[PDB]
Amino acid sequence: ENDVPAILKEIDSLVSREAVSAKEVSDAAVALTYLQVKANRRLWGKVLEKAGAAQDYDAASLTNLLWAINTGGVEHFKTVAELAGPAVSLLPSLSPVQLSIVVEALGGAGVKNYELYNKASAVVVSKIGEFKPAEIARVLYGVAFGGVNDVALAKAAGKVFASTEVDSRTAAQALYALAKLGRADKATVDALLKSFKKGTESASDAAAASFALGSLSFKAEKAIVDALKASAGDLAPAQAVEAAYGLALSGATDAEAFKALFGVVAPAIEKAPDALEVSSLAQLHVASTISGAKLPAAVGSFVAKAFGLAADAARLKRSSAESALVADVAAATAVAFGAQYRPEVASAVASYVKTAPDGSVLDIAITKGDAKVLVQAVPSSLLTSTTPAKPLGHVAAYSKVREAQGYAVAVVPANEFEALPDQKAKAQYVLAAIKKVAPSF
Amino acid sequence: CTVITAEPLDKLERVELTKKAEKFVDAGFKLVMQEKIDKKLLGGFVIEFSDRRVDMSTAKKVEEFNNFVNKLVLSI
Amino acid sequence: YLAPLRSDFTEEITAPKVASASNLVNEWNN
Amino acid sequence: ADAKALDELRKPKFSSKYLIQHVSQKLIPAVK
Amino acid sequence: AVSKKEVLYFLSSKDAESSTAVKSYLKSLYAGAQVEATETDASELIAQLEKKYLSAQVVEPGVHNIALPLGESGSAPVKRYAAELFNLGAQAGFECPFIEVSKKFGQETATSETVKDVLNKTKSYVSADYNAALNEVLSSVEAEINGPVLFDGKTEGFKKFAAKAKAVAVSRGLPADTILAYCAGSANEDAADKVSKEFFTWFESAYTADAAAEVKAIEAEAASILDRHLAKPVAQIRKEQASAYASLLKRAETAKGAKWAEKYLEDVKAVQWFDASVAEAPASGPKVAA
Amino acid sequence: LTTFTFSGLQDAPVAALSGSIKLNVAAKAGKAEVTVAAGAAKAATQVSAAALRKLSGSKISLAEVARISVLHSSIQNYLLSLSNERYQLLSQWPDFTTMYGKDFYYRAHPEDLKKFYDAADEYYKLYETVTEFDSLSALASQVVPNYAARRRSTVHPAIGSTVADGAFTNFLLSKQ
């Protein structure tokens, strides 16, 4: 009358037969999330195989299937990305809540389907009154994570979230979408952070708001760090790492929250050292040195190595317009420290590529006795997507982690470095940026 | 002599190019130059001794590099 | 079931050279 | 015996990756 | 298995043996080992050659995990296939394909003077049906201008050449105005992004057309290969395939000491294991450890 | 998928869609009353709001276990779905065995009966070779290397002629 594994075998035999249509797949997936069956990977594989095999599709079964895929936290890019054709065929016959669920669902998996996001953003900005603001935040999440830099829907969401007072989780999802988009509209972000006072039913959305405000660098809200402090048990290590990183980037001062987060994070690396990817380990080292909070002795040297690994791996896969910009800034450092001709320009630039204490390699490393000045070029991938174009919080993270190694990191962003006439003004700008960081040079 | 450079020279490019070029005259030989410009050289230089040519340009270096690596991967 | 291992690159960008239709369906109908 | 692993089974088999690695290991020192 | 520049490329990849070597290296670093210093040497030619031969080790075992959408009608299988090739290029350290082939054009013709020479140098990267349509426009404006059309940007021959190359590109189906508006940029974000949303509709049209052309050629090749194979008797098929298997296996047992040959023979043993574990439980699949 | 997801107990499915399994949620503002009903065994629990948000904290990250690879298995599935198309037209072949009897032997011209017996032997050849499905794997291994060498491009794995022509349109119609 209440039995979990026998109903798992009933769903298992219901999905293993040959002619399963889509409604049986959808409710098998929903019934597989509601029983929380992350322990069985083969059953989710059978359900996703039958979801890829189905050809009939209406609004309801597609919507509940996509809801179940994202609530259960399963990821298979093939069967989810092949569910977007059923979406674009059924898109005008979708309800606004159904379009919300499918666009958030296909955006969360990262489906690069530009026709779906264009024809969904056109729908949600053609009839904006139809959409309750949670539907707005879900479509914003999906269009942001699907790889379109859509600011039309971002401006429409800013108007809705400034006009309509919204939920805590709704505002958190909108903050996560705006953080991936890199937009930092204070008129929108303020209207979202004012919604974090009614008490939050989840901890993952407070952690996502902390990571979002860290990525945008507004400041720590103090109505988010306390909710994250009390409820640091609802987070995976890969989630508490993002939480602590976004707390340290926004400039939080509470150490009790960092104790509560690293008490989750550090025994996960004690049990399994390799289970967390090196982007999370680098974010952990950032959060461990910026706020100064302490974590065990193996984990400290581990993330100290892993920040260097992730740093020179991101250097190795450099975007090739960041690389020419780093060459331009290094030539400007050459003719700013005094190098009249091109042989000593090239000799200075090749001299500036000294290594790092963590094993990495730094592009423009100028040392004078004990005082060292590192120069950073922040091209456009680490800028805000607006016409002010303030650099994102990750370059402040990199600067503040290199600063604990002995450097006085000078930031040379490319929105203004490229707006200079020639090499003399660029050398003047680089020297002025160095002097207001370290005037001892 | 005659030197062809990609862009017009600096006065240290001229001096160390002059010091580079005395390895191709094996005596106490002075060089006068007739410096020309060819943008299809991508840096480096081409020395023309009117009986002898030294190609220290980098267009020659990248095409010889490409010949080397396109030959060596056929060897393995 | 195994294939020859190759290590070579495609330096050109070419349309992928669609092959002509065989007559085996027409010959089997014949 | 049987029931090998999960990550040992996800790897594609007859891709090269080790002729490319062999050509790198015989080419990059020979061109340095 | 790790040479400290291989493992930096394999961090951002989600392939199985790449993540296995990454996890083994990270697990050896957790037991107190030291990160080797990254080499600040191997100048631009060696750096680009090592990039070419390190990205290929992420590309080509990642190609074999992308199912070709053969015989699948619709947009979503071809969009899945091209999206997986996009994510594989991003994992391997490539840029967008547009940015990467425009970088190829800028690298090839950094040294050219006349526009017929940029057509002779980017011959390998543009379709010959487009290269011929540009060569005839170049000869058309070369008859009237009575000069080699130089690659300048403001000369009257170049302006009246580009005003016709835009016409032939509009004839081809390439909206040159939206592509130029995206790659040039605009000031107001609400009028730059409304043309980025048109560039991305063209771009999605472009990469699904290219992926569908690749799928159509693989479909045609497989149908041609099968219909050549279905005309043989069974004994010829069995002896031809047995001879091909035995020759390709002897080629891997000939060269020993190499890593690729022992990985090849390990993979043959793994196929034999797959057949054995399906043989012992055929209605459930291969035995996966759980 | 992403590290933070925002779904669970809000606009969730209120009922199942097919009658093969019955599922109802009686959701209040705080928790949910779910009773999943599948045939003989039915189960029931009270799923929290902090459980459907805690479910995507770890990811399943499904991956296919293939005999050789996923690319090879896609090509072999296409070869099998083409051999089905040829088998379906060897399925509509007329029964020549209903004309083997000696009343058909002696009424017929000798060369026409020799042609008829050759046609029967030909059908047995075609049917014996279209059902050799243990040949499709080594047939799929002949499409793999040339395709996989086309994807080791020096530009991009996903590059094609349309994107390269559009980028030449941008490159050539810009200021040199």
Q: What is the dihedral of CA E59, F161, A112, A324, to 10 degrees?
A: 70
Query: How many Cβ atoms from other residues are within 10 Å of residue F10's Cβ?
Result: 17
C-alpha to C-alpha distance for A304 and A357, rounded to whole angstroms:
10
State both tokens at E231: 């005309």
Task: Provide CB contacts within 8 A for E240, sequence distance 6+.
Answer: E232
| Domain extent at residue B9 | 1-76
Is A373 within 8 Å of A406 (Cβ atoms)?
Answer: no
Q: Transcribe A55-93 into DSSP letters.
A: ----HHHHHHHHHHHHHHT---HHHHHTTSHHHHHSSTT
C-alpha to C-alpha distance for A255 and A258, rounded to whole angstroms:
5
Q: CA dist E169 to E37, E153, E165, Å?
A: 50, 18, 6
Is B53 within 8 Å of B47 (Cβ atoms)?
Answer: yes
Q: C and A: touch, per 3+ CB pairs < 8 A?
A: no
Task: Provide CB contacts within 8 A for A273, sequence distance 6+.
Answer: A302, E26, E27, E30
C-alpha to C-alpha distance for F136 and E229, rounded to whole angstroms:
10
Give the number of residues written for chain B.
Answer: 76
Q: Residue B13 and residue A342: Cβ atoms within 8 Å?
A: yes
Query: How many Cβ atoms from other residues are within 10 Å of residue A257's Cβ?
Result: 25
* Beta-carbon contacts below 8 Å between D and E: 84
Which chain D positions have a beta carbon within 8 Å of B65's beta carbon?
31
C-alpha to C-alpha distance for A228 and A244, rounded to whole angstroms:
10
C-alpha to C-alpha distance for F143 and F71, rounded to whole angstroms:
10
* Closest by Cβ to E111, choosing from B42, B61, B69: B42
- Which value, in Å, is the radius of gyration of the alpha carbons in chain C? 17
Which three-class secondary structure state does DSSP give residue A165? coil
C-alpha to C-alpha distance for A266 and A237, rounded to whole angstroms:
8
Is A83 within 8 Å of E72 (Cβ atoms)?
Answer: no
For the sheet with B3-5, list strands across it: B36-37, B3-5, B45-48, B53-55
Which chain F positions have a beta carbon within 8 Å of D19's beta carbon?
none
Which chain C positions have a beta carbon within 8 Å of E231's beta carbon?
24
C-alpha to C-alpha distance for A276 and A266, rounded to whole angstroms:
11
Which chain B positions have a beta carbon within 8 Å of D27's beta carbon?
69, 72-73, 76
Q: Which of E13, D19, E59 is nearest to F157 (CA)?
A: E59
Task: Provide CB contacts within 8 A for F28, sequence distance 6+.
Answer: none
For tokens 């999802």, name the residue. A173
Composition of chain A by helix, strand, coil, percent to 5: 60, 5, 35
Q: How far off is chain C from F45, nearest CA to CA, in Å?
A: 49
- Pinpoint the alpha helices (H) of A255-411: 256-271, 278-290, 297-316, 322-334, 342-351, 393-402
For tokens 């992926």, name the residue. E211
Is A373 within 8 Å of A437 (Cβ atoms)?
Answer: yes
Which three-class secondary structure state does DSSP give residue B47? strand
> What's the number of domains chain B is made of?
1
Q: Transcribe chain F into DSSP letters.
A: --S----SSSS--SB-SSTTSEEEEEE-SS-EEEEEEETTEEEEEEE-HHHHTTGGGS--------SS-HHHHHHHHHHHHHHHHHHTTSSS---GGGG-SHHHHTTS-HHHHHHHHHHHHHHHHHHHHHT-GGGHHHHHTTTHHHHHHHSSBSS-TT--HHHHHHHHHHHHTS--
State both tokens at A169: 């989780």
Q: CA dist E263 to E196, E288, F66, Å?
A: 46, 21, 17
Is F154 within 8 Å of C9 (Cβ atoms)?
Answer: yes
Give the number of residues written for chain C.
Answer: 30
Q: Which of E231, F15, A271, E122 is nearest to C23 (CA)?
A: E231
Which chain C positions have a beta carbon within 8 Å of F152's beta carbon?
8-10
E74: left (phi over 0), alpha (psi -120 to 50) or beta: left
Which of E13, E70, E86 is best to mutate for the F interface (most F CBs within 10 A)?
E70
Identity at F97, one-letter amino acid code = T
Q: Residue E21: closest CA among chain A residues belongs to which residue?
A: A274
Burial class (CB in 10 A: 0-12, 13-18, 19+), E198: middle
Measured in whole angstroms, the distance separating CA A245 from the mean position of its chain's CA atoms is 11
C-alpha to C-alpha distance for A144 and A117, rounded to whole angstroms:
9
Give the number of residues written for chain A.
Answer: 441
Integer distance in angstroms from the first to the last C-alpha of chain B? 43
State both tokens at A303: 């993330």
C-alpha to C-alpha distance for F11 and E234, rounded to whole angstroms:
59
* Backbone dihedral angles phi then psi of residue E67, each to the nearest 5 degrees: -65, 125
Interface of F with A in 81-140 (CB under 8 A): none
Q: Which of A290, A406, A409 is nearest to A358 (CA)?
A: A406
For tokens 């976004």, name the residue. A246
Interface of E with B in 109-148 (CB under 8 A): 110-111
C-alpha to C-alpha distance for A4 and A10, rounded to whole angstroms:
10
Q: Which of A112, E68, A69, E22 is nearest to F62 (CA)?
A: A69
State both tokens at E118: 């940029």
F65 lies within 8 A of chain D by CB? yes
E271 lies within 8 A of chain A by CB? no
Which chain F positions have a beta carbon within 8 Å of D16's beta carbon?
148
Neighboring chains of B (3 or more beta-carbon pairs < 8 A):
A, D, E
C-alpha to C-alpha distance for F146 and F135, rounded to whole angstroms:
19
C-alpha to C-alpha distance for E227 and C21, rounded to whole angstroms:
9
Please list, residue by residue across F45-79, b when 16 or more beta carbons sit within 10 angstroms of its beta carbon and e when fewer do: bebbbbbbbbbbbebbebbbbbbbbbbbbbbbbbb
Q: Residue A74 and residue F39: Cβ atoms within 8 Å?
A: no
Q: What is the resolution of this structure in A?
A: 3.0
Q: Which residues of D touch B (CB under 8 A)?
A: 22-23, 26-27, 30-31
Q: How far off is chain A from B9, nearest CA to CA, in Å?
A: 9
The interaxial angle of helices E16-30 and A297-316, nearest 10 deg, is: 140
The alpha carbon dihedral of B69, B70, B73, B75 has a sign of negative
C-alpha to C-alpha distance for A235 and F146, rounded to whole angstroms:
47
C-alpha to C-alpha distance for A191 and A120, rounded to whole angstroms:
24
Neighboring chains of A (3 or more beta-carbon pairs < 8 A):
B, E, F
Is F96 within 8 Å of F124 (Cβ atoms)?
Answer: no
Which three-class secondary structure state does DSSP give residue A383? strand
Q: Which residues of B touch A (CB under 8 A)?
A: 10-13, 16
Composition of chain C by helix, strand, coil, percent to 5: 20, 5, 75
Please list, residue by residue across A102-124, b when 16 or more beta carbons sit within 10 angstroms of its beta carbon and e when fewer do: bbbbbbbbbbbbbbbbbbbbebb
Q: Residue C5 and residue D16: Cβ atoms within 8 Å?
A: yes
C-alpha to C-alpha distance for E24 and E2, rounded to whole angstroms:
9
Q: Which of A13, A37, A338, F165 is nearest to E105 (CA)?
A: F165
Question: ∠ CA(A398), CA(A403), CA(A407), 5° rounding?
Answer: 115
State both tokens at F134: 């243990």
Q: Which of F63, E176, D9, B40 is nearest to A41 (CA)?
A: F63
